[PDB]
């Protein structure tokens, strides 16, 4: 129950990184399109 | 000290319009706006002067033209002052050369903080606009500007008037901003028009794309490059989806 809390900390880091990656793939893709046009 | 020139949307667009059209001959004009403290140069508006092929020279800046135009500006409620000049070079980059310097210098003796703005519209097709902002040594606030500090004191003491670049920022306005994006019901009419006429002709559009496809399949057999074969198939698939969608 105290245990559970310890496991939540490790879980919480993963959820935050996992959601952040999604946002990143999407920005990277637009930037990839424009930059190719720039070269 | 640090200097930051805000060039506006409507200024950019007048500079670029004029300068592209004058080609290969140079066009120069006066930048209108206001100076604020020592940290902000606003360019709000811009008009063209007469054209020059000689590189822009001191005999060449129409004393009459700028006076005559301003008097008319005045009655349409443009009352803010000249803060500098902009000039084109197509073919030469975004820089000074000695003739510009002598031009520039004369302006500064009038003003005290004037900026020279150079556009190159050959580098405005690098898919960004290259634009620069310059001022000579002019001091009276630039006395902290070009482990140090011996250098610059001696630099302004050995020579007054030597170029330096300045930083660029663009500040703009939300109605200007929305206008730029609504470029891209006439709209409705056009998209739909093409859709209709695509559907009329599709009987033929069908046939040619099987032939392209037939080719593609054959190429890959020999091949057993890859990117090219894929792209050709991708175009054919994209087009079909759009075509099913149309009806």
């Amino acid at each position: 129950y105290f245990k559970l809390k310890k496991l939540e900390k490790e879980y919480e880091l993963l959820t935050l990184q996992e959601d952040y990656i999604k946002d990143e793939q999407r920005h990277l893709k637009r930037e990839l399109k424009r930059a190719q046009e720039e070269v | 000290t640090k200097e930051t020139v805000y060039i506006s949307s409507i200024a950019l667009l007048k500079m670029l319009k004029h300068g592209r059209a004058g080609v290969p001959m140079e066009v120069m004009g006066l930048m209108l706006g206001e100076f604020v403290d020592d940290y902000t140069v606003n360019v709000v508006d811009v008009f063209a002067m007469p054209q020059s092929g000689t590189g822009v020279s001191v005999e060449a800046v129409d004393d009459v033209f700028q006076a005559k135009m301003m008097d008319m500006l005045k009655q349409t409620g443009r009352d803010q002052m000249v803060v500098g000049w902009y000039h084109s070079h197509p073919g030469f980059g975004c820089w000074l050369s000695s003739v510009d310097v002598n031009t520039q210098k004369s302006f500064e003796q009038l003003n005290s903080r004037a900026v020279a703005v150079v556009v190159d519209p050959i580098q405005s097709v690098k898919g960004k606009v290259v634009i620069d902002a310059f001022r000579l040594i002019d001091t009276g606030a630039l006395i902290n500007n070009l482990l140090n500090k011996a250098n610059i004191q001696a630099l302004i003491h050995g020579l007054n008037r030597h170029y330096y670049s300045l930083n660029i920022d663009y500040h703009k306005t939300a109605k200007e901003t929305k206008m730029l994006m609504n470029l891209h019901y006439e709209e409705k009419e056009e998209s739909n028009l093409a859709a209709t006429k695509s559907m009329v002709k599709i009987a033929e559009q069908y046939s040619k794309r099987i032939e392209e496809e037939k080719e593609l399949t054959e190429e890959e057999l020999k091949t057993r490059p890859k990117k090219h074969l894929s792209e050709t198939a991708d175009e054919t698939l994209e087009n079909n989806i759009v075509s099913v969608l149309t009806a």
């Binding site: - | 409507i10 109605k175 206008m179």
Partner: protein, 255 residues
């Protein structure tokens, strides 16, 4: 085709006009548009504000500077030679009766039928918000012309430099129907002509289309079968990519 092409510079200069003249309370602000329109394709390339003063209980009282058009045009000529008189601009948001009297003024000084460009400045329309009209004989009456963007290769990159299908098409259509309906309800109030004739016609020409859509479906069904094949050809290139990857992966493990 009859066409107008309008610089962004034109419309942003209009955007600036309306604030820069402090014109407020849905009054008129007036300037001149310039370009080349000797032809039947209007190219609008430049513009200028014109001093304009309106009275607050009369819009048929106007003050407009005739000398300014003439005098500024000469300055325009000395600067570039592309920048001739073709028409004028107003802040809209509709046509006026008073629009004619000003249009009549510009008619002498143009070399084509004078163009009235209505630039909406409130930016609360859909799409390109500007509608372009040309005065001809009917009295005298304004008539819509197609108004589209312009391009110059530097200018379009600069427009982007500053800023850096089906659902829309359909939504805009229903929007239209809704507006057509509003106008009809208003007319019905007024009654108890051109419009009516148009409504009847449309109707005559969903219902009539119904039968033909049935034929379209058999041809569309062939197109879907085509799609099926196309996915398979693409699928072939994708598969190849996975093998190449595989070979590399296996070699990597070994070393």
């Amino acid at each position: 085709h009859e066409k107008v092409t309008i610089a962004p510079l034109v419309l942003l200069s209009a955007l600036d006009h309306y604030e820069r003249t402090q014109t407020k309370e849905n009054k008129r602000c007036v300037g001149v548009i310039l370009g080349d329109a000797n032809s039947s394709t209007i190219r609008v390339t430049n513009s200028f504000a014109l001093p304009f003063e309106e009275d607050e209980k009369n819009s048929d009282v106007w003050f407009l500077d005739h000398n300014y058009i003439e005098n500024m045009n000469e300055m325009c000529k000395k600067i570039n030679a592309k920048e001739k008189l073709i028409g004028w601009y107003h802040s809209g948001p509709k046509l006026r009766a008073s629009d004619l009297k000003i249009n009549e003024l510009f008619k002498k000084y143009t070399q084509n039928n004078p163009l009235l460009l209505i630039v909406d400045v409130k930016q609360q329309g859909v799409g390109l918000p500007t509608d372009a009209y040309v005065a001809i004989e009917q009295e005298k009456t304004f008539l819509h012309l197609p108004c589209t963007i312009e391009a110059e290769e530097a200018e379009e990159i600069g427009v982007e430099h500053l800023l850096r299908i089906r659902l829309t098409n359909q939504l805009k259509s229903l929007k239209g129907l809704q507006s057509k309906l509003k106008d009809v309800v208003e007319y019905l109030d007024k009654v108890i002509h051109t419009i009516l004739g148009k409504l009847q016609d449309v109707f005559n020409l969903n219902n009539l289309q119904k039968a033909l859509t049935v034929k379209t479906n058999d041809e569309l069904m062939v197109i879907y079968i085509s799609n099926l094949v196309r996915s398979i050809i693409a699928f072939d290139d994708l598969i190849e990519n996975k093998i190449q990857n595989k070979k590399i992966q296996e070699q990597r493990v070994k070393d």
